[PDB]
């Protein structure tokens, strides 16, 4: 009787596949050749932020596009002033094993999660003048990939429990829990409209969920290894994944398919962190060969190289202003590339 | 130039930087050990000697160096996705029990795990400190059981000393490099602090070797 359900499952998978192929009538490569490429992109280092004495594993900008919080493995996450390279704050962590550090869009809070299965929320603007822990969001049973803020009261986390949860700062329990991934989810990206989010796991599959409802609407496949990074396209209708095959594939939410792969034979290492630009024409990528790449999100040809780091770039993010790009690698240095 | 508030903001950052380096130099004078091993392979007993939901960090001190141990093999998770977090550790403490050589393939699983982590890209230079636990019961069970059961292509006398020597050399041959990475062997001698003295000596050795390598003299 179970084989009948298996037969139905593969039949539905086949019918979805051919419907997906039928809707596929062209490729992005055959049309972007019509429009001229930008050419060569030079990313000169502007700010080097030398405060950490251990490898950093994540960083995040603020919506102000000037403050950025970076968390390293030395046990302290630092709030930086990009324009003047100043340490606004230094928050000692209760566990040095930290994988992520988010920033509230209002700038009031900073979150942090790691191998302790807790995303602890810190309060910045306080009466006493010292950064204090607001909440500890335990109850995940698995190491934490990344926390992301919706508001000052809602946060979405993706842990090694092979699940994603929507917490509530004032209460402390996860109101909505997203499940369906098989392996541990290693990345999460929030759509600009803040209504859907895409998570990347070890299943080599990326799927998006209805934040309001709580279940996935569709799941994309095609990757060969674990997806280490996912970032949304600024228009909110696409996202570019990142695996250990050095391929930054790009998918469509409305077309429910994949537009174009970003494969270069010179790179066979892993991808650590991908991102887009404010316009979305060029997508950056953080590779495992100590240097950062700058692709072309429409033409799929490398439009530059950002190679100022002597170690693998563990994270990179672009200001919503669009001016600078912060790349933080294991040499404990944050470098700003305008 | 800079205004009054900008000047005071810079002074605040420099004060933060001083405290960061102060805590940084304090943490540098401290040795981190990645403890792991098979289930009930002496880890539950090693922590009781080296103490007095993802990371169980055991904190204790000795003559000096303020050893720190992060028990990671007890929790049940994936294999090698957080293994990059522990790169740069001073040493790895592998606890392999000799009483699992007859229980069913546990000895094979421990040896394969040893081979996987000894040749790993991250731990190319980090030393591994062995701990062969349950020595007395190992002698009793090899008295009650033969030795060729574990290894089909190996033959030898059924004595404690040759079996301990043969398993020790078998473990040490599992690595692909010998010049940079070093393996230190022991047998968890009784329950006193003699194990703590051994790990202190081994950690002292690897610190000296890496210090000379930094000086370009090794």
């Amino acid at each position: 009787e179970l084989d009948q359900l298996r037969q139905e499952a593969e039949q539905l998978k086949n019918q979805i596949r051919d419907a997906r192929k039928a809707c596929a009538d062209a490729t992005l490569s055959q049309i972007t050749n019509n429009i001229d490429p930008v050419g060569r992109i030079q990313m000169r280092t502007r700010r080097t932020l030398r405060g950490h004495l251990a490898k950093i594993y994540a960083m995040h900008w603020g919506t102000d596009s000037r403050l950025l919080v970076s968390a390293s493995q030395d046990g302290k996450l630092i709030i930086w002033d990009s324009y003047t390279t100043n340490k606004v704050h230094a928050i000692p962590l209760r566990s040095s094993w930290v994988m992520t550090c988010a920033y509230a869009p209002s700038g009031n809070y900073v979150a942090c999660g790691g191998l302790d299965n807790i995303c602890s929320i810190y309060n910045l603007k306080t009466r006493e003048g010292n950064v204090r822990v607001s909440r500890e969001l335990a109850g995940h049973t698995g190491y934490l990939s990344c926390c992301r803020f919706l508001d000052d009261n809602q946060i979405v986390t993706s842990s090694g429990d092979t699940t994603c949860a929507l917490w509530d700062i004032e209460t402390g329990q996860q109101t909505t829990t997203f499940t369906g991934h098989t392996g541990d989810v290693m990345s999460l990206s929030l759509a600009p409209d803040t209504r859907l989010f895409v998570s990347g796991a070890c299943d080599a599959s990326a799927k998006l969920w209805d934040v309001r409802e709580g279940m996935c609407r569709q799941t994309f496949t095609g990757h060969e290894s674990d997806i280490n990074a996912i970032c949304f396209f600024p228009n909110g209708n696409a996202f570019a994944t990142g695996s250990d095959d050095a391929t930054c594939r790009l998918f469509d939410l409305r077309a429910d398919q994949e537009l174009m792969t970003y494969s270069h034979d010179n790179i066979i290492c892993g991808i650590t962190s991908v991102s887009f630009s404010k316009s979305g024409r060029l997508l950056l990528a953080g590779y495992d060969d100590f240097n950062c790449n700058v692709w072309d999100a429409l033409k799929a040809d490398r439009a530059g190289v950002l190679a100022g780091h002597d170690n693998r770039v563990s994270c990179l993010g672009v200001t919503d202003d669009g001016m600078a790009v912060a790349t933080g690698s294991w040499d404990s240095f944050l470098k700003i590339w305008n | 130039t800079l205004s009054a508030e900008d000047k005071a903001a810079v002074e605040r950052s420099k004060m933060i930087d001083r405290n960061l380096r102060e805590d940084g130099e304090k943490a540098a004078r401290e040795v981190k050990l990645l403890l792991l091993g098979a289930g009930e392979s002496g880890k539950n007993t090693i922590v009781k000697q080296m103490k007095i939901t993802g990371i169980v960090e055991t904190h204790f001190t000795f003559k000096d160096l303020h050893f720190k141990m992060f028990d990671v093999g007890a929790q049940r998770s994936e294999r090698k996705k957080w293994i990059h977090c522990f790169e740069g550790v001073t040493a790895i403490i592998f606890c392999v029990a000799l009483s699992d050589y007859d229980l069913v393939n546990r000895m094979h699983a421990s040896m394969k795990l040893f081979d996987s982590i000894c040749n790993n890209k991250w731990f190319t230079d980090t030393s591994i400190i062995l701990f062969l636990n349950k020595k007395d019961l190992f002698e009793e069970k090899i008295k009650k059981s033969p030795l060729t059961i574990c290894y089909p292509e190996y033959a030898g006398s059924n004595t404690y000393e040759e079996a301990a020597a043969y398993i020790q050399c078998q473990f040490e041959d599992l690595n692909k490099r010998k010049d940079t990475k070093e393996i230190y062997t022991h047998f968890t001698c009784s329950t006193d602090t003699k194990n703590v003295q051994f790990v202190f000596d081994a950690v002292t050795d690897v610190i000296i070797k890496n210090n000379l390598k930094d000086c370009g003299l090794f």
């Epitope: 002033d81 006493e128 | 205004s3 009054a4 508030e5 005071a8 605040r12 004060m15």
Partner: single-chain antibody, 231 residues
Amino acid sequence: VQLVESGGGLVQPGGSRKLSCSASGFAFSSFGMHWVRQAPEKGLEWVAYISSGSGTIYYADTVKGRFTISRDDPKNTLFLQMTSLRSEDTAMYYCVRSIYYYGSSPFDFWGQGTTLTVSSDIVMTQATSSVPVTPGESVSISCRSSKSLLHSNGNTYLYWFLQRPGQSPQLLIYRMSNLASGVPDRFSGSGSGTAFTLTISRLEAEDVGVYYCMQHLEYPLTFGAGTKLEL
């Protein structure tokens, strides 16, 4: 949080006295500290300042050498010891906390104050000193400067303080535009170099007091003469 000072009393001219302020409820080491002198009838005047960790000390040119300040961070106490007092030092002294980073609000909290009786700067001028108002009426208060307070980084370092009759003044707006935390949104502020204004919308009770404009572009921090509201 609260700042409580003590050690004020009548002295003879040429004598000495030391003023101590006790802090509690906040990280006293992370905050700079200011002393401000409020004359018996006149407006606010600045005295001295100590940075965090006592790495920087500034004095008003009227009390240079004659006064000296110190802090003991472990016991959360601030000191102001004065020697050879003059007859013009009879006033009320406040201890004001101020912490400086990006997006901070210096002079956020003011001490209660201790009485005391003895028997080239950027001049901040307020054209008016007393304007009658009634509840429910919008009133604009303007205070000029002898130099432009706009800096090259975009910050216009101008502050406004409201001293209700009976207690210490409090911060209303910092950098002439940013409302301080805990104040009603009815207040407002804008302007430019050498021309600043504070427009209050829908005036009500508990808003009556003397409004002081303070510049923080450079030391000493000259205050304004103050504009008093009446009903």
